[PDB]
Amino acid sequence: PRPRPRPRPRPRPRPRPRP
Amino acid sequence: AKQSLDVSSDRRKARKAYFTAPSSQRRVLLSAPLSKELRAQYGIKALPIRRDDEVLVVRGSKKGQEGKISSVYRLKFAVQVDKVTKEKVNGASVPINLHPSKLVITKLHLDKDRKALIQRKGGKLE
Amino acid sequence: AGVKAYELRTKSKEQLASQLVDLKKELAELKVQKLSRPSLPKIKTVRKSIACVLTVINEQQREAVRQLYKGKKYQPKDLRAKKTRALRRALTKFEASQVTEKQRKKQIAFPQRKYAIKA
Amino acid sequence: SEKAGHQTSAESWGTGRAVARIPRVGGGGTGRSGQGAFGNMCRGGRMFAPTKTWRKWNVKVNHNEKRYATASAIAATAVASLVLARGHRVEKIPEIPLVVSTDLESIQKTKEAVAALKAVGAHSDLLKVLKSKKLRAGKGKYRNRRWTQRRGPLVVYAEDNGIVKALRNVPGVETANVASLNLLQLAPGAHLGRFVIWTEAAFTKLD
Amino acid sequence: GKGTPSFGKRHNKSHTLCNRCGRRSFHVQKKTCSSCGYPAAKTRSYNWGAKAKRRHTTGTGRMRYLKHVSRRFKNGFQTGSASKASA
RNA sequence: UUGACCUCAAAUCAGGUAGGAGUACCCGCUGAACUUAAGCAUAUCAAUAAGCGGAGGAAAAGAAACCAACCGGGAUUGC
RNA sequence: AUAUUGGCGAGAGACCGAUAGCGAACAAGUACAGUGAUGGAAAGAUGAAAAGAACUUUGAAAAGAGAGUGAAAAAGUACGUGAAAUUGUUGAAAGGGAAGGGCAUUUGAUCAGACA
RNA sequence: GUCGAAUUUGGGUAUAGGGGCGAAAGACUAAUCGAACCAUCUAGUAGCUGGUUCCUGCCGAAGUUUCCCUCAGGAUAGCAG
RNA sequence: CGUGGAGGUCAGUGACGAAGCCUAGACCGUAAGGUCGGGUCGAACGGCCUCUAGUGCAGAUCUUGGUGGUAGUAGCAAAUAUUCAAAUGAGAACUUUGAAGACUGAAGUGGGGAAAGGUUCCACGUCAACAGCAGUUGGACGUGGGUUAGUCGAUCCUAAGAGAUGGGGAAGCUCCGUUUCAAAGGCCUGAUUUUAUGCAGGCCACCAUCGAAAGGGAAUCCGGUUAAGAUUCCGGAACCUGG
RNA sequence: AAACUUUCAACAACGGAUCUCUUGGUUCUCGCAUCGAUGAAGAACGCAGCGAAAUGCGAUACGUAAUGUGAAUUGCAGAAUUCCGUGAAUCAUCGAAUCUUUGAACGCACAUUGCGCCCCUUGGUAUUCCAGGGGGCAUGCCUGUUUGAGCGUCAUUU
Ligand SMILES: [Zn+2]
C-alpha cells in the first residue's frame, strides 16, 4: 500500500478582469 | 485485608506481574498440592512441580487419569503428563496442557535439594 | 560439554594460552562443517569455552599487576574504584572531617550535653 | 494531560479550498496530514473544557452542623422503625438499642468474636452479608472496585483490647469508638437506621 | 517551467550523512549538520522544538552505561564479590 | 667569571582538573509581540515566552549598616 | 521547615476504556513525507485447549462438495459479539411525467381480549 | 526568434528573510514571494459568518427613550419571566 | 424521560444464557421512553432512594471511517505495423524459436560513462498481488550466485573559497582574522666506540589544515576466459616507485 | 402479464458500529539522589544451530566471570551427564571483565574506513627501507620538577 495521495486543489477558475 | 504499605491490591499490577514473571518465579507459581497420603507422610501441603513426578488428575475432562509428568512448560503456565494426550485426526498424538493447581502429586521425586526443601518447610521425611 | 572456570584457575599462564589455541583450532573446523550440515549447535559450546578462557586469562594478569601496585600511591586508573565521576571529586572522610584548631577546643570544652526535663 | 490534543502544528488552510477552515495537520505522506486537529469535534484533538486539578474536591462543612447530623444518626439507632426500613434483619432480637457486656472488647480470636454476635441475635444480619456479594455492574471492576456487598452490624466500644482485630476479617462488620462515631458508618448512603451493637462501657461513655 | 521540467534537474545533494547522528542532515558546503549541530561541541536543541528533544533525549537509545548506574547505587557501589553460601 | 633574585617561557616533564548530556524544580543574563485599553503611542500582556551562561538533591537566602517608634521586636525560608 | 510535568523505586483514583486515554495498550517517535529544519500515522479480541480440518471426490490450480475437530465452524489464521449506509436472492404488494405524509373507510395480511 | 557570441552548459564556490540577488518584471530566492519555509508565543483577536444535542406543561416579547468616533455594536429606561 | 460512574438497598437477574443486536410481533405513557414474546448471542447486568458529570445531535462547505447514485458510463486513440507456423502450457493477439514484412538510419530506438538509484545484474523456481487488456513472461515474487588492480580512479596538489592557532571582540551562543602586533621549527649530520642518539657548528623563516573521481598528476598492454566480473582473472610481454 | 423501480421481512454479502473485555494512558500522594576524559547521553556497523524487527550484547558479541535458585529451554532441531549435583535455565542477582567504529572525542584530518610521528618488539641477509604486534602523541589551567630567556636586576672575580 503506497502512501495516501496528497490533497490537490483545483486550478482556481480563470480570473475575471478587475476594474 | 491488606495491612502493609508495600503490598499492592491493584488489579492490573498483579496481572502484569503474573504474565511478565521470569522463569525462576514461575516455578513457585506452578505449585501442586500433595495427596492425602503424602500430606500425612511428609507434613506439608504443596510443592513446586518437577519433571520426574507422578501426578493424579482430579479436575477437568481428564479427571481420574494419572501418570508421570513429561515436561514442566513454564511459558504458558502449564504442565504435560506423558499418558494423558489427545489423538489427532491424522494419527499423531499431542500432549494435553494441564495446570498444577488442578493436579494432585501422588509420588515425589526426591533428591538432595527436594529433601532440603521439605525439611525447610517443616517436613519430617519418613 | 564446555570448560569450567574453576578448573581453569588451577592452571598456569602457559597452559591457559596453549588451551586457547586448541579451542581456536577446534572452532575453525566446526566453521567448515557448519556450511555442509543443516544445523550445528555444537559451535556454541566451543565459542563460549573461548570466552571462559579469555576471562580467566584476563583475570590472572589483572590480579598479578594489582599486587605490584599494592600498598602504594598512583595505581593505574582501571584498577581504581570508579563508583561515580562526582564522588571521585568529593572530599575524602579525612578531609570532610577536618576542623580548624580553634573550633576543636570549643567542641571539647562545650559538647552537646545529654539531659531531660522531669526533675 | 494539559498538552493532550495540542502536540501538533496544525494550521488552517483558510477559505477557498472547498474544505472546512478548521486547522489541519500539515506535511504529507502519512495519512495524518490534512486531517483536522485542535478541535473538540476532531479525532485526536482536545476535548471541550479540559478537566483541571484545581477543581473543588473537598467540601467544607460547619463543625456544629457536622455534629448535628452525627447526633441525629445516633438517634437513628433508636427504635427499629428506621432500622428495619434500612435493610437490617433485626426482627428476631431482644430490643433496640442492643447493649452487650464489655467482654467483647477483650476478645482476641475471630471465631469466638463471631459466636458472640450470633448469640445476641445478629445471626440473621450476618447472613445478609456473605450472600449479597455480587460483581459490580459498572466499569469500576478493573478500577479496584470489583465486588459489592451489603452492610453489616456496627460494633461500638469504649476502649480497644482486641475487638478491632477480631472483627476485622468478618465481612460487613465495622468497629468504631465512642470518640469518633463516624457519620459515614452511622448513616451509610444517607440512610438512617444503622444496626449498632453497643457494649456496656461504650453505652455509659456515650452520655 | 518551474514545475515538472524543473524537478528533473534535481540530482545533486545539499545534505549528506552526519558522523555524529547519521540522520543525513550534514550540509556539504557549510560543513555543519542541521540536526545535531555537528561539529559544534554542544548538541543542537531548542525549547520551541519540544517534540524534537523527545526524539533524541536520554532513554531513546541503548543507554549502555546509565542502565546499570541505578543498580550500582542501590548496593552502595560495592567492590569485591560475594564469597559463597551453602546449598 | 661565577652564584643568586625578579619577571617571562619551554617540555608527550610529575600529579591533577575543565568541557558534554540532562535541565521538572533552582541561580542569573538577555528579552519580545499577539493580546487588553472596544481605536492607539504611555501602560497592559511582562520584569513572561523564545535565546544564553551556571548548580544541586534541593538550590537560593541566612546570623542585621534589619523591623520598628512600641511596656519594643530580634538570622533566613515557607504557610 | 520550602520547590519539583525530569530521573529511580513505590502506593492509589467517584479518571479514560481502543475515533477515548500520552502521538504511540501492537517490531511508535515505528512505517512514511520533506534538500533541510521538521512533520508523523494506521494497527488490541478464534477457542478452555490448534483440537488450525486427516481422508474421499470435482478442478490445471485457487477452492468447492462430503467427512472430521469443538460446547458452538451462526468461532476456519478474511477468525468474539457483527449494527447502519449499500448489495444479492426469495416472498408479498404497488406503479399513465416523482416518491414519501395527514383524516376516514374498504380489501388482504396479522394480532388481541373475555366464557356464570 | 537566435545560432561564434553581452553564447550555451556541468561541477566547485560565494551571497539567507525586512535579508540576498535583480540588463529592473516587484521579478527570482526548492510547484511557496508587494517580504520564503519550519517550530514556538498561540486554543493570538474578531462589535463579523456558521453551528449549538430529550419531552411535556405554564407565562410571554422587542425593533422604542437617552448617551457613546454610536450607525452590523453596547450601556440605560421600557416591554417579559 | 434517558446515559457513564459513586454510596445505600432489593440476602435483585444470570452459562437451565447476562449485556448487545435484529424483529409493517404485542402492551403501557400526551410525549421523552419503558416493558414483553421470538431470533441471534456468550458473561456479566438491573429496579429503587440519593450523589456526580467529559450526560442526549440531522445539519456547523463539522471530524474520522465506511458506502452509493452517476456506471459497466467517461475512457484505456501521439511516437507508420504487424502476419504465419511450431514449441511450452489447464489456459497464447502478447512467452520462446523459425519464417515473412517493417522501423530506429548511425546528432540511432546502436556501443559506453558522469550525477543519481542500490542489487534493479545473473541463474533457478513461482504467477495471489503489480505490469490501468492479457500473461506460461518481467526491472514482479521466492531462493541463491556475482563486483579480484603497484600501472584505472580515489588517496596527493592547489583554484575560487573554507577554516583552526596567536590575538582582539561579544553577557553569551560565538564573531573578526589567515601571516595576521607571537619567544610560532626540524634538516643534514658530525662527534660517540661507558649508551644510546647527549651535545658540538652551519643552514633554512616557507609559519596549520580543508578545497576538483571533468584542472595538475610516477608507471600496462595484447590474446583468452564467466550464466552474470576484468586495462583487475589466466597466458604472454612490459613499465614505474621505494629499498 | 414479466422485466424494471420502490417498500418490508427472511437468509446471505459489504462494512466494523454496539456490547463485553485491558500487561496501556492519565492524575494525585509517598520515598530516594545516582551521568561524564576511569570516555557520558546519542549514532553507525555487527553478534543467534535456523532472525527481519523489537529487546539484549560487542570480535570473550541475544553473552563471559561471580553469587543465589535447584532441573529446564521450547517454533523446530539439538546436547545428552547437566540430574542425591561446584549444576539445567532466553532464570534471578550482579560487586569481576570484555566493550567494534564513533561521539564533549583528544596525533593531524574526515563527503577519505585518508595521512603521520615516538617507544618497545618480530620478520624480510636491515639504527635509515617495507611489513606484523604491543604501548603512546589534543587544548586551557593549577601545583611541583627540569631546562632556559631578558645590561629587569644584585653581588663577586681577574
Ligand atoms: Zn548530525
Kindly state the cell numbers that stand for C81.
574504584
Q: Are residues C34 and C60 in the same domain?
A: yes
Rounded Cα gap, residues D164 and D166, in angstroms? 6
What single-letter amino acid sits at D110? Answer: T
Q: Identify the residue among D17, D21, D35 best suited for mutation to test binding to A, counting A beta carbons within 10 A and taking the highest.
A: D17
Q: Is E72 on the interface with C (CB under 8 A)?
A: yes
Q: Is residue E18 a known part of a binding site?
A: yes
Q: Do C80 and C67 sit in the same domain of this protein? A: no
Distance from CA of B124 to the nearest CA of D (A): 30
Q: What is the 8-class DSSP label of residue E1?
A: -
**CA angle centred on D129, ends D125 and D130, rounded to 5°:** 135
Please list every residue in chain B whose beta carbon sits closer than 8 Å to the beta carbon of residue D168.
1
Cross-chain Cβ contact D144/B1 below 8 Å: no
Nearest Cα to Cα of residue D195 among D110, D117, D131: D117
Nucleotide nearest to E31 (CA to C1'): I162
- Strand J, nucleotides < 7 Å from a protein CB: these are 21-24, 26-28, 33-44, 48-50, 56-58, 60-61, 63-75, 77-79, 81-87, 89-92, 94-99, 102-105, 110-111
C/D touch flag: 3 or more CB pairs below 8 Å: no
Closest CA to C65 of C51, C73, C57, C76: C76
Asked which of C41, C58, C73 is the last residue of a domain, the reply is C73
Using the CA of D124, which nucleotide's C1' is the nearest one? Answer: I11
Q: Is E21 annotated as a binding residue?
A: yes
CA dihedral sign of residues D156, D162, D165, D171: negative
C-alpha cell at position B73: 512448560
Please give the grid coordinates belonging to residue B36.
Answer: 492425602
| DSSP conformational letter for D178 | T
Q: How far from the centroid of its chain's Cα atoms is residue C13's Cα?
A: 19
Residue closest to E3 by CA, chosen among D106, B10, C51, A11? A11
CATH number at residue C95: 6.10.250.3450
**Resolution limit, Å:** 2.4
Give the domain range for residue C3: 1-73
> DSSP alpha helices (H): ranges in chain E?
4-7, 50-56, 69-74
Interface of C with E (CB under 8 A): 81, 83-84, 87
For residue D28, the chain A residues in CB contact (below 8 A) are 3, 6
In degrees and rounded to multiples of 5, residue D41 shows phi and psi of: -95, -5
Let me know whether C67 and C78 are in one domain. Answer: no
Q: Are C83 and C89 in contact (CB under 8 A)?
A: no
What does DSSP say about strands B54-57 and B66-71: parallel, antiparallel, or unpaired? antiparallel
Residues C51 and C101 in one domain: no
The reply to whether C82 and C68 lie within a common domain is: no
Interchain pair A9, D18: CB under 8 A = yes
Per the structure block, which three cell numbers stand in for E66? 546509565
Helical ranges in chain D per DSSP H: 63-74, 81-85, 110-119, 123-128, 163-166, 183-186, 200-206
Could you give the 3-state DSSP secondary structure of residue E25?
Answer: coil
The answer on C64 and C22 residing in a single domain is yes
CB contacts < 8 Å between B and D, how many? 8
Distances (CA, A) of D181 to D71, D72, D105: 9, 12, 16
* Nucleotide closest in space to E2 (CA vs C1'): H31
C-alpha cell at D28: 504529507
Q: Is E54 annotated as a binding residue?
A: no
| Cell 493532550 belongs to residue | D4
Chains C, B in contact, 3 or more Cβ pairs below 8 Å = no
How many domains is chain C built from? 2
Q: Which domains does chain B have, with CATH numbers?
A: 1-126 (2.30.30.30)
Give the Å distances, CA to CA, from C21 to C28, C47, C53: 11, 12, 10
Buried b or exposed e, range D10-40, using 16+ CB within 10 angstroms: beebeeeeeeeeebbbeeeeeebbbebbbbe
Q: How many CB atoms lie within 10 A of CB D158?
A: 18
D89 CA – J116 C1', rounded, Å: 99
Examine the domain organization and report whether C68 and C89 are in the same domain. Answer: no
- Give the residue on D whose Cα is nearest the Cα of A8: D17
E36 is in an annotated binding site: yes
User: What DSSP element (H or E) covers B83?
Assistant: strand B79-87
Task: Examine the domain organization and report whether C63 and C10 are in the same domain.
Answer: yes
- Partner residues linked to D156 by β-bridges: D176, D198
Question: Is the bond preceding residue B22 a cis peptide, omega within 30 degrees?
Answer: no
Is some CB atom of chain B closer than 8 A to the CB atom of D144?
yes
Provide the experimental method for this PDB entry.
cryo-EM
B12 closest CB neighbour out of D142, D146, D168: D142
| Statement to judge: residues C6 and C58 lie in one domain | yes
Q: Do D29 and A7 touch (CB under 8 A)?
A: no
Q: Which residues of C touch E77 (CB under 8 A)?
A: 81, 83-84, 87
Chain D window 121-150: residues with CB closer than 7 Å to nucleic chain G are: 139-140, 142-145
Q: How many residues does chain D have?
A: 207
Tell whether C69 and C95 lie within a shared domain.
no
D146 and B1 within 8 Å at the Cβ level: the answer is no
The x, y and z cell numbers of residue C9, run together, are 584457575
Amino acid symbol at D128: K
Neighbours of ion ligand 1 (CB under 5 A): E 18, 20-21, 33, 35-36, 38
**With a 7 Å cutoff on the CB, does D146 touch strand I?**
no
Say yes or no: C54 and C110 in one domain.
no
- Same domain? For C59 and C30 the reply is yes
Any contact of D with B, at least 3 CB pairs below 8 A? yes
From the CA of B3, how far away is ligand 1's center (Å)?
54
According to DSSP, the residues that pair with E33 across neighbouring strands are: E26
Sign of the torsion formed by the C-alpha atoms of D58, D64, D69 and D73: positive
User: Which residues face B68 on adjacent strands?
Assistant: B54
- Distance (Å) from CA E38 to ligand 1 centroid: 5
> Cβ separation of D146 and B11 shorter than 8 Å?
yes
D144 to chain B: which residues are within 8 Å by CB?
Answer: 9-11
| Phi-psi sector, E76: left (phi>0), alpha (psi -120 to 50), beta | left
